[PDB]
C-alpha cells in the first residue's frame, strides 16, 4: 500500500465564509456561536438561545455548475454549498479538476439531516419532481460525482456525530487499497427545523446556556451548529500540497451497554486507539495533540478523557496536549470530525494551536487534568512536533480515530534562478476573482510553489470562467491586467520576421 495524504481543504463554518476567517476566529478567541434569530425566533419551544450558524445560505452560482434556476430553487442548501466547497478544496491542492475527470475518484459524504426534502414535499398538489433529484440524501454525493465526472464510489453515510470522520476513514481505506487514486470527503449540516432541536433537548443532549464547555466542571451539554467542509484525499504521486499523512484510520461500535444505547463507553474507545497506534507502529510517546470529541457532556467527557489517559498516557513523561474545536464554534453533528480536522490542519500550517474556550476549572472526575498528564490548550502554544490524533464518537456508538503525521517540509534554499521575473495568470467568474488572485500572487511573489500552484489551476475554459488576467511578478514594472475572454477557440499563428 502507498501513502494517503490530504491535499486540499475548504469549508463554510459558523461566522466564517472561508477557512481563513475560521482561523482568524479560532486564534482571535472570538465566540462563533451567536445568539441572533436568523434561523428562527430565539427561545422558541424553550430551545437554547445560542447556536452556530453560517453567514448566508442563499448564494449559489448556478450557471457554473449547470443548474437551471428552477432546479436551484429546489436544491438543498447543503448541496449548493457543498458543490462550491468541493471545487474550492480541489483547487486548494493546486489540482486542476479537469485532470480528475474520467478517473476513479470516490465521493464519500456524511449527512444526518434531510430537512429541506420535507419542506419541499409538503404540498402534493403543487410540488415539483425536481426536488427528488436535488434534495435526496444520496444526491449529496451523486451530484458531485455527476458534475466532476468521478467514476468511483458515491456513498452518503449516515452515522450520527461521526459521519464525516467515517467517510474520511472509508476514503482512506479505498485509496490505501488501490481502488481509487483520490477521494472527496465531505460533511454537511444545516439547522432548519426547530423540531430536531426540540428532540435533542428532550433527550437531554443540549446545554441550557448554549455553550459547549469542554473539559469543564459545569459541562451541561452541547450547542447545535451548522457547517460544510470538504477534504481532497489523494495518494502521494498526485498531491501537490500535503497538509498531513494519514498514518492509520479505524472504526468500531461500542456494542452492548448496560446504561443504554446513548451512554458513551471508554473501554471500546481505548481499544480502538490502542489498536490503531499498534498497527501503525507509532509509539504513544510520539503523540503531541489529540482532538477530543469534547462535547461538554457530564458523562461523555470523563469517559473519553480517561480512555485517552489509559491508552496513551501510560508511560510518557511529557504531558499530552488535548483540545476540542467544539468550544469555539459549537458542534456540527455530522461534520464534527471534519471541523476538528480543519482546525488541526490550520494550526499545523500556522505553527500555533488554537486555544480552547470556556475552560476555567478542570473536571474533578478526570485525574489526568489535575495530575498534569493531560493539558488543555487554553493559550496559543507553538508546535514542537510529533503526531496528532482525531477521534469522533457518535451517540449511537460509532467510534472513529485517525493519526496524522504533519508536514515538516522547510522552505527551499535560495537559488540563483529565483531572482528572474515570473509570470502569474489567473481566471475567474467575475473581475473580483481575478483581482484577488493577482493580489495574492503579488503578496507572496517570492514563494515559487504558491505561484506554481496558482498557475496550475488557471487553465479553465472561457465558457466556465469568462474573465482572465495576468501580472508579471518581480519585474521592473507592470501591474495587473484583466479582461473578458471572447468565446470560441481562436487559432494561433506565427510570423517570422526577416
Amino acid at each position: 500500500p502507498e501513502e494517503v495524504v490530504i491535499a486540499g481543504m475548504s469549508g463554510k463554518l459558523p461566522e466564517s465564509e472561508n477557512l481563513q476567517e475560521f482561523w482568524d476566529n479560532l486564534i482571535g478567541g472570538v465566540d462563533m456561536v451567536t445568539d441572533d434569530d436568523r434561523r428562527w425566533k430565539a427561545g422558541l419551544y424553550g430551545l437554547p438561545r445560542r447556536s452556530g450558524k453560517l453567514k448566508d445560505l442563499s448564494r449559489f452560482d448556478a450557471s457554473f455548475f449547470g443548474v437551471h434556476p428552477k432546479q436551484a430553487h429546489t436544491m438543498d442548501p447543503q448541496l449548493r454549498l457543498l458543490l462550491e466547497v468541493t471545487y474550492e478544496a480541489i483547487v486548494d491542492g493546486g489540482i486542476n479538476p479537469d485532470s480528475l475527470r474520467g478517473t476513479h475518484t470516490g465521493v464519500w459524504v456524511g449527512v444526518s439531516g434531510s430537512e429541506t426534502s420535507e419542506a419541499l414535499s409538503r404540498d402534493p398538489e403543487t410540488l415539483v419532481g425536481y426536488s427528488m433529484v436535488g434534495c435526496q440524501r444520496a444526491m449529496m454525493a451523486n451530484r458531485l460525482s455527476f458534475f466532476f465526472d468521478f467514476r468511483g464510489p458515491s456513498i452518503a453515510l449516515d452515522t450520527a456525530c461521526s459521519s464525516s470522520l467515517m467517510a474520511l476513514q472509508n476514503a482512506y481505506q479505498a485509496i490505501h487499497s488501490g481502488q481509487c487514486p483520490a477521494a472527496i470527503v465531505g460533511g454537511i449540516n444545516v439547522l432548519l427545523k426547530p423540531n430536531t432541536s426540540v428532540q435533542f433537548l428532550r433527550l437531554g443532549m443540549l446545554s441550557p446556556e448554549g455553550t459547549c464547555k469542554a473539559f469543564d466542571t459545569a459541562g451541561n451539554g452541547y450547542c447545535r451548529s451548522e457547517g460544510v467542509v470538504a477534504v481532497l484525499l489523494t495518494k502521494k504521486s498526485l498531491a501537490r500540497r500535503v497538509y498531513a499523512t494519514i498514518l492509520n484510520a479505524g472504526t468500531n461500535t461500542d456494542g452492548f451497554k448496560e446504561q443504554g444505547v446513548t451512554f458513551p463507553s471508554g473501554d471500546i474507545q481505548e481499544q480502538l486507539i490502542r489498536s490503531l497506534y499498534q498497527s501503525a507502529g507509532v509509539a504513544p510517546e510520539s503523540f503531541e495533540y489529540i482532538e477530543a470529541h469534547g462535547t461538554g457532556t457530564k458523562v461523555g467527557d470523563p469517559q473519553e478523557l480517561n480512555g485517552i489517559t489509559r491508552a496513551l498516557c501510560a508511560t510518557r513523561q511529557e504531558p499530552l496536549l488535548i483540545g476540542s474545536t467544539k468550544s469555539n464554534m459549537g458542534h456540527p453533528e455530522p461534520a464534527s470530525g471534519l471541523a476538528a480536522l480543519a482546525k488541526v490542519l490550520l494550526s499545523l500550517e500556522h505553527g500555533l494551536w488554537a486555544p480552547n474556550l470556556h475552560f476555567h476549572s478542570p473536571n474533578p472526575e478526570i485525574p489526568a487534568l489535575l495530575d498534569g498528564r493531560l493539558q488543555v490548550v487554553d493559550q496559543p502554544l507553538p508546535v514542537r512536533g510529533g503526531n496528532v490524533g482525531i477521534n469522533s464518537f457518535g451517540f449511537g456508538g460509532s467510534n472513529v480515530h485517525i493519526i496524522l503525521r504533519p508536514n515538516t517540509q522547510p522552505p527551499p534554499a535560495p537559488a540563483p534562478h529565483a531572482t528572474l521575473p515570473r509570470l502569474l495568470r489567473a481566471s475567474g467568474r467575475t473581475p473580483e476573482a481575478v483581482q484577488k488572485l493577482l493580489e495574492q500572487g503579488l503578496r507572496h511573489s517570492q514563494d515559487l510553489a504558491f505561484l506554481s500552484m496558482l498557475n496550475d489551476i488557471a487553465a479553465v475554459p472561457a465558457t466556465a470562467m469568462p474573465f482572465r488576467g495576468y501580472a508579471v511578478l518581480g519585474g521592473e514594472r507592470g501591474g495587473p491586467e484583466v479582461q473578458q475572454v471572447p468565446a470560441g477557440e481562436r487559432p494561433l499563428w506565427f510570423i517570422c520576421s526577416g
Binding site: 434561523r39 428562527w40 425566533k41 422558541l44 445560505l57 442563499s58 448564494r59 449559489f60 452560482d61 448556478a62 450557471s63 457554473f64 434556476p69 436551484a72 430553487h73 429546489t74 436544491m75 442548501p77 449548493r80 430537512e115 429541506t116 420535507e118 419542506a119 419541499l120 409538503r122 432548519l192 427545523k193 426547530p194 423540531n195 467568474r429 467575475t430
Partner: protein
C-alpha cells in the same frame, strides 16, 4: 458570482382552530361544571 439569491426553507415551512378540553375532575379548573346539572344529567 453571487448576484442572485435562491430559495431557502423557512421556519414556518415545517409542522408545529381552537381546541378546548372540558374536564370535570376535581384537580381541573373546570371542576365547577359538575354543579350545572339538569334533569339528573350534567
Amino acid at each position: 458570482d453571487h448576484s442572485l439569491a435562491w430559495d431557502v426553507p423557512a421556519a414556518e415551512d415545517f409542522p408545529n382552530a381552537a381546541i378546548y378540553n372540558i374536564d370535570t375532575s376535581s384537580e381541573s379548573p373546570d371542576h365547577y361544571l359538575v354543579d350545572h346539572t339538569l334533569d339528573g344529567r350534567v
